[PDB]
Ligand binder design. Structure first.
Ligand SMILES: *[C@@H]1O[C@H](CO)[C@@H](O[C@@H]2O[C@H](CO)[C@@H](O[C@@H]3O[C@H](CO[C@H]4O[C@H](CO)[C@@H](O)[C@H](O[C@H]5O[C@H](CO)[C@@H](O)[C@H](O)[C@@H]5O[C@H]5O[C@H](CO)[C@@H](O)[C@H](O)[C@@H]5O)[C@@H]4O)[C@@H](O)[C@H](O[C@H]4O[C@H](CO)[C@@H](O)[C@H](O)[C@@H]4O[C@H]4O[C@H](CO)[C@@H](O)[C@H](O)[C@@H]4O)[C@@H]3O)[C@H](O)[C@H]2NC(C)=O)[C@H](O)[C@H]1NC(C)=O
Ligand SMILES: Cc1nnn(Cc2cc(C(F)(F)F)ccc2CCC(=O)N2CCN(c3ccc(S(N)(=O)=O)cc3F)CC2)n1
Ligand SMILES: [Ca+2]
Ligand SMILES: [Ca+2]
Ligand SMILES: [Cl-]
Ligand code: NA
Ligand code: NA
Ligand SMILES: [Zn+2]
Length: 805
């Protein structure tokens, strides 16, 4: 019930919410059908439109008008945004030259520069260049302030997950808005864009910026706008709140535009019909900036211009139908479109089987335009699994396509020419970031970054402590003139042991063999120095990784590589080696094919054994430092130490051996040397965080040797490739991956072909940030470089995407 006979007189766009049944006058009352009877008349005035004209200048105030051009409008804070231009000979903000804002220039009574977030739906990154001729105000923000060539959204690249990620700094698996449509099996309730379930607070986790602000004493405008409120009235409302008295005035505001997304779905991302929505959005930015200029706030407020996701060409004919693959199509529920999520239609059917659905959807048609995954197998960079609202079975849809359950779903629903939701590394899905104001830098371009980082920066802009989130605070310090956050590196929790030679060969009973009994004081002191760390500066270039949890591990040195060997997991946590551009690849010699050698620094009890692999018919082994890249025949024996061995499915060994034999030397050639850190990851509860021992679900049969869910590598070189990786004076360059450790290559449809045709494609799909690996291992890399810590945090958030420009 709403008692809609209250009044909005003196309450239009009130900031505090009034509870049912009393009627509301806030910017969300329409969406709840709860506005007072006189909300339209009082709060949504339209008379005489949105612009002053010469003949209105100096008019007698008429309270009916949408906005005013009477002499008293400046002190009332309700002039039309163009009032000073039409009536007082002033210029539009866009016509003024840009001039560096070195210090905030704020009216007295302003405690801090306000922040205005101007959010645009479906604004594809490339619109900034391609539409620049019809967007002069946006182009002035971009060229005079701080801009990125693009900003990466979160997956799925849909509105609700992304706007709420912008507001919280959280991945959708953590904040709970994992799609525009969701079923929660614990609530037994469905969330949809249409209707009332979405307003229930139980769906929305984390802490959005307006709550962070309010908890810390910083007042916030209400961020949400009902769709029927015209944009001109939204801008006027913001400008009116900015005229409130000091103690009542908010410091943070949001504007939202449904465009250009609305027209992009109808016309495609570059339909000729898209020029006018871009012009209209630019005009709205111009009203805001003119309005700030009237209030003397145009060199006081920080403005962020930001989008939720881009837009791709998608039409009805590019739809795959599950009815062309599955026999049982009526036994499933599909969430369809630019991603798929599948679950059982009925929980009472125990002849539903995910294994059979996946197999029926795998590589079944030559050009197939989607790929099925159990969610724990999705690329870890998507961070899309740890939530009960994410169905176990997921379809990753190719850009430009849809999936649907049956043809009748698509013609009983062609209209549309645009859509979005695909993998967040797809170029068409990228969106925009510009920051302009006293706290942002002047005429500065910054590299692309992820939208999960912005909440921390918005908190820095407002002097707030951010709630715990998934940004890396400090990684965006290079966007800011001041208010930077100066983090300190985490403290190491476990210090390593440095074992020497402590065991005789006969103490080991591992079932391993090696033909190594090939028997010099010159060369002998030398090999002793290598085991004590004499080449360590060449192979460990950025210091040893720090171990941020409690565990027992050993540093082991070798001529060609250094490792941190876990006595608990029986294998290295990390293995670090440098490969110069001059390095040569060699074979594994015949007599060494099955060689595994006890390591006399590490007890039998803290070693793997060969018998376990012999007996486990599913599981084989590989090595972390590759024997192919040994510096000499004699050094190569170190690569067969049992402390360099790790468990690998034979199907995974295909991928790993090709990476190590072919790709590393390719990278060294191209990048002028590389330093590689490789290791295992265990994430059996798919939470993106390092597993403890009692979470491990699989061991090499009959043993305590844990099986990794993934293998990573971090591949670092000099950004100035004219300097070799091991003698780099300035910034670094990194690419990394987290490969899933699977017992088949069903993910790669062309895996019967030579590895040259499919392995690197797989690795690109599983590209990762160094920070993703940090979460999954509890290790902290790049501890000892020449570089500032914020620069290193930016390097750790980099993702190498393998998209063109
Ligand atoms: C990205 O950043 C985020 C934020 O930093 C990281 O997420 C944090 O990760 C921590 C570990 O996974 C986690 O800390 C746990 O908190 C538990 C208390 O939880 C409530 O309180 C917080 C704070 O206000 C709150 O935000 C939580 O919100 C979640 O849950 C509600 C729904 O109930 C949602 O609305 C909301 O969206 C959010 O859901 C997400 O997180 C949960 C897990 O908390 C998932 O289940 C969801 O799928 C979704 O992703 C809560 O309201 C606390 O209980 C935990 O302690 C347990 O484990 C420790 C080990 O130290 C042990 O001492 C205890 O025994 C205890 O276990 C007991 O319970 C078990 C379960 O019943 C049981 O098995 C045992 O036998 C025991 O009885 C733990 O400290 C923190 O909640 C989240 N925060 C958020 C906001 O998500 C995230 O990791 C980052 N991601 C990456 C990749 O880095
Ligand atoms: C979601 C979400 N999370 N946080 N916020 C708040 C937020 C955060 C941020 C920012 F600062 F974070 F950037 C910036 C702006 C906003 C306000 C967004 C807003 O006013 N709307 C209401 C209209 N919405 C909407 C879209 C489409 C349809 S449909 N399918 O029926 O056409 C129905 C809808 F209700 C989009 C959200 N929105
Ligand atoms: Ca959107
Ligand atoms: Ca885990
Ligand atoms: Cl969805
Ligand atoms: Na085996
Ligand atoms: Na295959
Ligand atoms: Zn859309």
């Amino acid at each position: 019930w709403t008692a809609t006979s209250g009044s909005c007189k003196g309450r239009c766009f009130e900031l505090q919410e009034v509870g049912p049944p009393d009627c509301r006058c806030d910017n969300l009352c329409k969406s709840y059908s709860s506005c007072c009877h006189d909300f339209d008349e009082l709060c949504l005035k339209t008379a005489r439109g949105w612009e002053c004209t010469k003949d209105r200048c100096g008019e007698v105030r008429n309270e009916e008008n949408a906005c005013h051009c009477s002499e008293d409008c400046l002190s009332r804070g309700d002039c039309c945004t163009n009032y000073q231009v039409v009536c007082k000979g002033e210029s539009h903000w866009v016509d003024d030259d840009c001039e560096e804002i070195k210090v905030p220039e704020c009216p007295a009574g302003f405690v801090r520069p306000p922040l205005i977030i101007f959010s645009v739906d479906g604004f594809r990154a490339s619109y900034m260049k391609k539409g620049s001729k019809v967007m002069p105000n946006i182009e002035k923000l971009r060229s005079c302030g701080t801009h990125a060539p693009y900003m990466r959204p979160v997956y799925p690249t849909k509105t609700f997950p992304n706007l709420y990620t912008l507001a919280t700094g959280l991945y959708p698996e953590s904040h709970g808005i994992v799609g525009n449509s969701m079923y929660d099996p614990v609530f037994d309730a469905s969330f949809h864009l249409r209707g009332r379930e979405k307003f229930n607070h139980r769906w929305w986790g984390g802490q959005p910026l307006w709550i962070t602000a309010t908890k810390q004493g910083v007042r916030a405008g209400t961020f949400f706008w009902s769709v029927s409120i015209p944009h001109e009235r939204r801008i006027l409302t913001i400008l009116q709140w900015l005229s409130l008295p000091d103690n009542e005035r908010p410091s943070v505001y949001a504007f939202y535009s449904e465009q250009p997304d609305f027209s992009g779905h109808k016309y495609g991302p570059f339909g000729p019909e898209m020029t006018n929505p871009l012009r209209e959005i630019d005009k709205t930015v111009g009203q805001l900036m003119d309005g700030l200029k009237q209030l003397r706030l145009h060199r006081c407020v920080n403005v962020i211009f930001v989008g939720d996701h881009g837009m791709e060409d998608v039409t009805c004919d590019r739809t795959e139908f599950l009815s062309n693959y599955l026999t049982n199509v009526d036994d499933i529920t599909l969430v369809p479109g630019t991603l798929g999520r599948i679950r059982a239609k009925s929980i009472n059917n125990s002849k539903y089987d995910p294994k059979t659905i996946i197999a029926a959807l795998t590589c079944k048609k030559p050009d197939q335009h989607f790929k099925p995954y159990m969610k724990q197998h999705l690329p870890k960079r998507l961070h899309y699994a740890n939530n009960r609202r994410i169905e176990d079975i997921h379809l990753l849809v190719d850009r430009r396509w849809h999936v649907a359950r049956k043809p009748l779903d698509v013609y009983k629903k062609c209209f549309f020419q645009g859509d979005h939701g695909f993998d967040n590394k797809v170029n068409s899905m990228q969106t925009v970031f510009v920051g302009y104001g006293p706290t942002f830098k002047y005429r500065t371009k910054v590299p692309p970054f992820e939208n999960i980082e912005l909440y921390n920066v918005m908190c820095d802009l407002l002097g707030l402590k951010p709630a715990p989130n998934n940004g890396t605070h400090g990684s965006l310090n290079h966007l800011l003139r001041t208010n930077t956050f100066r983090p300190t590196m985490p403290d190491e929790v476990s210090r390593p042991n440095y074992p020497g030679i402590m065991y005789l060969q006969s103490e080991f009973d591992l079932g391993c063999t090696c033909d190594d009994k090939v028997e010099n004081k010159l060369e002998e002191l030398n090999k002793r120095l290598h085991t004590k760390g004499s080449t360590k500066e060449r192979h460990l270039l950025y210091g040893r990784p720090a171990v941020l949890y409690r565990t027992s591990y050993d540093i082991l040195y070798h001529t060609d590589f250094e490792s941190g060997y876990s006595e608990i997991f029986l294998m290295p946590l990390w293995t670090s080696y440098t490969i110069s551009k001059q390095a040569e690849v060699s074979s594994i010699p015949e007599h060494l094919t099955n060689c595994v050698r006890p390591d006399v620094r590490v007890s039998p009890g803290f070693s793997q054994n060969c018998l376990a692999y012999k007996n486990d018919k599913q599981m084989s082994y590989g090595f972390l430092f590759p024997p192919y890249l040994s510096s000499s025949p004699e050094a190569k024996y170190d690569a067969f130490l049992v402390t360099n061995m790790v468990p690998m499915y034979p199907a995974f060994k295909r991928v790993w051996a090709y990476f190590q034999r072919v790709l590393v030397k390719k990278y060294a050639s191209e990048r002028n040397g590389v330093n590689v850190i490789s290791g295992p990851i265990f994430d059996y509860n798919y939470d993106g965080l390092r597993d403890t021992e009692d979470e491990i679900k699989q061991y090499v049969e009959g043993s305590s040797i844990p099986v990794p869910t993934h293998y990573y590598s971090i591949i670092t070189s000099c950004l100035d490739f004219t300097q070799p990786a091991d003698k780099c004076d300035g910034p670094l360059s990194v690419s990394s991956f987290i490969l899933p450790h699977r017992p088949d290559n069903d993910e790669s449809c062309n895996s019967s072909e030579d590895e040259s045709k499919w392995v690197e494609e797989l690795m690109k799909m599983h590209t990762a940030r160094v920070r993703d690996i940090e979460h999954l291992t509890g290790l902290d890399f790049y501890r000892k470089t020449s570089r500032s810590y914020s620069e290193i945090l930016t390097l750790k958030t980099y993702l190498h995407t393998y998209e063109s420009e």
